[PDB]
Design a protein around this ligand. Structure first.
Ligand SMILES: OC[C@H]1O[C@H](O[C@H]2[C@@H](O)[C@H](O)[C@@H](CO)O[C@@H]2O)[C@@H](O)[C@@H](O)[C@@H]1O
Ligand SMILES: OC[C@H]1CN[C@@H](O)[C@@H](O[C@H]2O[C@H](CO)[C@@H](O)[C@H](O)[C@@H]2O)[C@@H]1O
Length: 349
């Protein structure tokens, strides 16, 4: 009873898409295309961030440098960071790449996590032609491949998946997978799971979406307060009340800030300043005050979006002056996460 143990109702969104020339053949994701402005003109040639030491696809700069997500030595360090943050579940981005390098990295992440008693669940991304049939097939494959790994997460006996942009699939399709009577149900099968859909907009839209889709619960993802109704923390008390009334698990997402203008220069209105941790504190406090059972953290390491809690260092290169943790040390967001996990646990019975 030391106040240092991992919390297994705390999910931290993790991205495994970073590469180095030496391990991966290219400094993958550190190099990244710049997105055209969706409200902008034709003939934009926005260019690319080259992923050199000097110019990476983030407004911040990793303490660990331009690392590979396939480097077992980096993974070790990441797991130690999870232990410092007390975040017991790594919620792994999953893009259905169907390639050996994906398969290798997932096994490495599971192995490294297990050494530290961290668990892994999957965050099912909007891969091409995603639909409920190939989602079922992929859930079966992930549970078959990884379900007996000691680090594979279960909650009261069930795997858990987060489904990003779940609204891209109609509730009538979801029902087929997620109702106990659905044509291709997972309920009561070896492949049953807690399925957590993304609550985006107003209750008039989201309440029937979640019920009609038969999701087990919902999360909000966005680290930027006010980006959606669901990512506006003053709505969380009423979202939790509805969840409780309807037998759903609400897993609000909290984050330390947001800034993605290296890769999305037109998206400055979504910037949320970190204010030496005060933003993170405010958001985490709202989640805990809402009385939820589980919390998700956006993010461990979405460096493109500036939501990371992973350590960052000051850096000024000839090409860019990076943001940094300012008056706080590089590991502040890890140790502040541990503080909040303790407050969250204090709140759970
Ligand atoms: O436009 C940048 C934005 O893209 C993605 O968010 C989009 C979509 O995935 C979300 O569901 C809706 C919610 O209203 O917003 C966008 O259309 C995300 O990658 C997001 O992190 C990013 O900022
Ligand atoms: O994990 C959910 C969602 C969070 N925001 C992004 O990470 C998004 O991925 C898309 O944007 C990133 C850049 O931010 C890009 O590298 C990816 O290929 C996706 O286009 C995630 O889906």
């Amino acid at each position: 009873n030391l106040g240092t143990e991992l919390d297994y109702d705390t999910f931290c969104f993790y991205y495994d898409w970073y590469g180095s020339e030496a391990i991966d053949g290219q400094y993958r994701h550190w190099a990244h295309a710049i997105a055209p402005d969706p409200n902008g003109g034709s003939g934009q040639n926005p260019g690319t961030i080259p992923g050199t030491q000097e110019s990476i696809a983030s407004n911040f700069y990793p303490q660990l440098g331009r690392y590979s997500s396939s480097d077992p030595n980096i993974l070790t360090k990441h797991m130690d960071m999870f232990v410092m943050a007390r975040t017991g579940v790594l919620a792994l981005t999953w893009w259905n790449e169907q390639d050996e390098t994906e398969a290798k990295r997932i096994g490495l992440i599971l192995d490294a996590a297990d050494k530290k008693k961290i668990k892994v669940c999957f965050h099912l991304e909007p891969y091409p032609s995603r639909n409920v049939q190939n989602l079922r097939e992929n859930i079966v494959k992930l549970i078959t491949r990884y379900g007996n790994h000691p680090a594979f997460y279960r909650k009261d006996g069930k795997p858990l998946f987060f489904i990003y942009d779940s609204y891209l699939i109609e509730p009538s399709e979801w029902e087929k997978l997620l109702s106990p009577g659905g044509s291709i149900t997972i309920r009561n099968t070896a492949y049953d799971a807690l399925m957590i859909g993304l609550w985006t907009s107003s209750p008039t839209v989201q309440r029937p979406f979640i019920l009609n889709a038969h999701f087990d619960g919902f999360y909000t993802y966005f680290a930027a307060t006010g980006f959606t109704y669901g990512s506006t923390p003053t709505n969380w008390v009423s979202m939790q009340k509805w969840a409780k009334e309807n037998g759903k698990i609400f897993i609000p997402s909290v984050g330390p800030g947001y800034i993605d203008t290296r890769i999305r220069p037109w998206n400055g209105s979504v910037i949320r300043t970190r204010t030496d941790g005060q933003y993170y504190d405010a958001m985490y406090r709202k989640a805990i005050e809402a009385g939820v059972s589980a919390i998700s953290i956006t993010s461990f390491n979405e460096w493109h979006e500036g939501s990371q809690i992973e350590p960052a260092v000051p850096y000024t290169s000839s090409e860019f002056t990076y943001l940094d943790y300012e008056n706080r040390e590089p590991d502040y967001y890890l140790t502040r996460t541990a503080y909040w996990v303790g407050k969250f646990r204090e709140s759970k019975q």
